[PDB]
Amino acid sequence: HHLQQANIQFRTDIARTEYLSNADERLRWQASSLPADDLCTENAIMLKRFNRYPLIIDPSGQATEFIMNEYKDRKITRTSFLDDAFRKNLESALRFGNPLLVQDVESYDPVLNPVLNREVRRTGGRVLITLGDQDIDLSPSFVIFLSTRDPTVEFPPDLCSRVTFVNFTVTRSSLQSQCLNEVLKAERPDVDEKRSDLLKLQGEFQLRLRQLEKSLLQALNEVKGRILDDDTIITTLENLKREAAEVTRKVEETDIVMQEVETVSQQYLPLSTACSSIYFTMESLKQIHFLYQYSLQFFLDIYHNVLYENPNLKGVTDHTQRLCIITKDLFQVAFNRVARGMLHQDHITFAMLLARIKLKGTVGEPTYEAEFQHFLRGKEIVLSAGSTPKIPGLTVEQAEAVVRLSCLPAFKDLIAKVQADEQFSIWLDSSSPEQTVPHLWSEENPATPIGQAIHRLLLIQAFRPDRLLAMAHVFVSTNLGESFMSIMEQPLDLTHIVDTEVKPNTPVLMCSVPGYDASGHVEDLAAEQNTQITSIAIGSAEGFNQADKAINTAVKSGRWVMLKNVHLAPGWLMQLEKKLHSLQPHACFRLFLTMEINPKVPVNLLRAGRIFVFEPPPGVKANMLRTFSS
């Protein structure tokens, strides 16, 4: 906009990633371990056109592998600041010129300050640079890439001027764009073609159009009167006649196509916002319980299931119905996959979060930000000492709750209505008040069903908090469907999940509350599927060797392995995660790890595994049955 204001002429629809890189380079990067996104392509360009050495902030870790695969021909070597043999490796890299990748720059050593600043001191032919005691000879080929797995870092201003930043961090807009592109590719591939063709009216198509002129001119002057061998050279001249007009049509049809993709992409945008919100809620789940750790691969696998492997989409051709079914299945499958690895207390919490996300994303309903703000922070409202009156039939606590609820404008007449209601007490002492909450809130216009649901939620919170969870369930049933929570209130169907939704390299982590063992479920599943299973108990140093031998056998032969009580070996579990990251398992290979819920299990293993939380069924009856069976 500022350039436009100054009458400086610039392209209107510039594509940065396309203006700065040829398609061969992008193909080479995607051949390497580059996640193909707009942000990731821009970052990859920043790793090509850098004057100052780059700082790669990559919590995922994809970019380090990308740099390693790109520079493998130059024999790049891995190092970290925390490594003891870091300074000498840096000395060798600076001395000989091999490129280097240095990890964990959060603990940035200051000895690298001149190296990043390129403070060469020239003496004759010897170009020295100071490093510690030594003055080492800067080889021309030297390049260094600093890396950070931590995305929450505050670097000094000294280092910022000495380095250019490259952020491989997932955010709201990045994931929104990724999901929107995925939907456009999966459900409206014609618009995907017309979008990729709009970023190919830059260098790609014209480059090909004149690369054909190259071959034309190669086979145009190769003449000694033999141009008219049949007077059919026009074919070579007709192959260029077509494409030109074609790439003259698209250049003419570059405003219709742009408007069309805009209009069609805004339609599929609420789905993308819901996707971003859902994934970031799953990321937020960490601070509710230490086990509730889910990678972005988890959400992307959920989305691949919801888009491509969705049986509800079969036979549906209208795109609006497909979009609605995709949204509903997204919410349903996300809840099922997450809540299968959650304690029963927190299922309602995550369902409430998803219901709020849909309410943000649903059309025609207000956000209800104020009512939810009072729901979550109504107690934060202040009642002055002595300001609470006495109300007939209400205890002191219910009186404070009603006084707090009266702050909202809809419940302004709440106290008088409660006093005037003759049938209030029967409701207040009822066993299931949530099903028959009275109408007390004042409305200027009739409310939507979800508005009634949230108002009933506030009233139940005020009067009968003991039923709040039940009321909360109704709110979920009012927003996400009646059968939404029902699938969790069922026996665990490990057969289909392990067969379809689990990859061979992803271990099935079966976590149980202490004192409860879940290996019987895996044994039953192995019996049902008719698959040989080898079970090993990790309780000694020998068990590690047995497990390693069994896993090395099964990964090749595709057998099933179970490791019992692996929480006793945290470090060996870290080693097993590192091992699992490198394998190429057979399709039928499966690795079950049964453990008890303890905080000593590695966070990365939980992040890189399918978590299933098993709890005993509450009741005296089941307890006695378990005791008698044991």
Contact with other proteins (CB under 8 A) among 16, 72, 126, 549? 126
Pick one of 313, 568, 583, 588: the residue that binds other proteins (CB under 8 A).
568
Beta-strand runs (E) in 219-362: none
- For other proteins, the binding residue among 228, 234, 363, 382 (CB under 8 A) is 382
Q: How far apart are CA 589 and CA 591, in angstroms?
A: 7
Residues 42-71 that bind other proteins (CB under 8 A): 49, 51-52
Of 111-119, 242-250, 390-398, 426-434, the window that binds other proteins (rule: CB under 8 A) is 111-119
Pairing of strands 508-512, 590-596: parallel
Angle ∠(444,445,451) on CA atoms, nearest 5: 105
Residue whose CB is less far from other proteins, 302 or 353: 353
Q: Where do the DSSP E strands lie in 412-541?
A: 508-512, 533-537
Answer yes or no whether residue 98 interacts with other proteins by CB under 8 A: yes
Which positions from 443 through 472 interact with other proteins, judged by CB under 8 A? Answer: none
Dist CA 349 CA 478 (whole Å)? 15
Residue 232 interacts with other proteins (CB under 8 A)? no
Q: Pick the closer one to other proteins by CB: 270 or 570.
A: 570
Least distance between other proteins and beta carbon 382 (Å): 6
Size of the residue set binding other proteins (CB under 8 A) = 67
Q: Distances from the Cα of 162 to the Cαs of 49, 56, 93, in angstroms?
A: 16, 14, 19
Nearer of residues 11 and 496 to other proteins, judged by Cβ:
11
Q: 431 is written with which tokens?
A: 């066993």
Q: Choose, by CB under 8 A, the member of 32, 33, 80, 92 that binds other proteins.
A: 92
Query: Residue 138 interacts with other proteins (CB under 8 A)?
Result: yes
Q: State yes or no: residue 135 binds other proteins (CB under 8 A).
A: yes
How far is CA 571 from each of CA 216, 482, 513, 592, rounded to the nearest angstrom?
Answer: 65, 44, 21, 18
Q: Which of 472, 466, 400 is nearest to 429 (CA)?
A: 466
Among 567, 589, 591, 609, interactor with other proteins by CB under 8 A: 567
According to DSSP, the residues that pair with 153 across neighbouring strands are none
Residue 537's DSSP bridge partners are 564
Q: 270: alpha, beta or left, given left = phi > 0 and alpha = psi -120 to 50?
A: alpha
Q: Which lies closer to other proteins via its Cβ, residue 198 or residue 538? A: 538
Q: Are the CB atoms for 33 and 66 separated by under 8 Å? A: yes
Q: x/- binding map, residues 312-351, to other proteins, per CB under 8 A?
A: ----------------------------------------
Breaks (C–N over 2.5 Å) after residues, the chain: none
Interaction residues for other proteins, span 257-296 (CB under 8 A): 287
**Which of 111, 244, 468, 469 contacts other proteins by CB under 8 A?**
111
* Interface pick for other proteins out of 14, 110, 423, 489 (rule CB under 8 A): 110
- Verify binding: residue 106, other proteins, rule CB under 8 A: no
User: Whole-angstrom distance between the N-terminal and C-terminal Cα of the chain?
Assistant: 75
Judged by beta carbon, residue 100 or residue 472, the one nearer other proteins is 100
Selected range binding other proteins among 26-34, 113-121, 174-182, 274-282, rule: CB under 8 A: 113-121
The per-residue b/e assignment along 360-388, b for 16 or more CB within 10 angstroms, e otherwise, is ebbeebeebeebbebbeebeeeeeeeeeb
For other proteins, the closer CB: 53 or 612: 53
Give Cα 32 to chain centroid, integer Å. Answer: 21
Residue the block writes with tokens 């600076």: 94
Contacting residue, 97, 270, 438, 558, with other proteins by CB under 8 A? 97
Q: Per-residue contact track with other proteins, 504 to 543, x per CB under 8 A?
A: -----------------------------------xxx--
**Nearer to other proteins (CB atom), residue 87 or residue 289:** 87
**Which long-range CB contacts under 8 A does 448-453 form with residues at least 24 apart?**
448/364, 448/365, 449/478, 450/359, 450/362, 450/365, 450/368, 450/475, 450/478, 450/479, 451/365, 451/366, 451/368, 453/478, 453/479
Instruction: Locate 336 and state its tokens.
Output: 């099922």
The pair phi, psi for residue 363, each rounded to 5°, is -105, 135
Q: Is 85 among the residues that bind other proteins (CB under 8 A)?
A: yes
The reply to whether 558 sits near other proteins by the rule CB under 8 A is no
Site string for other proteins, 593-612 (x = CB under 8 A): ---x-x--------------
3-state secondary structure of 619: coil
Residues engaged in binding other proteins (CB under 8 A): 2-3, 5-8, 20, 49, 51-52, 75, 77, 85, 87-89, 91-93, 95-98, 110-111, 113-114, 119-120, 122, 124-127, 130, 132-133, 135, 137-141, 152, 154-158, 160-162, 164-165, 287, 373, 377, 379-380, 382, 539-541, 567-568, 596, 598
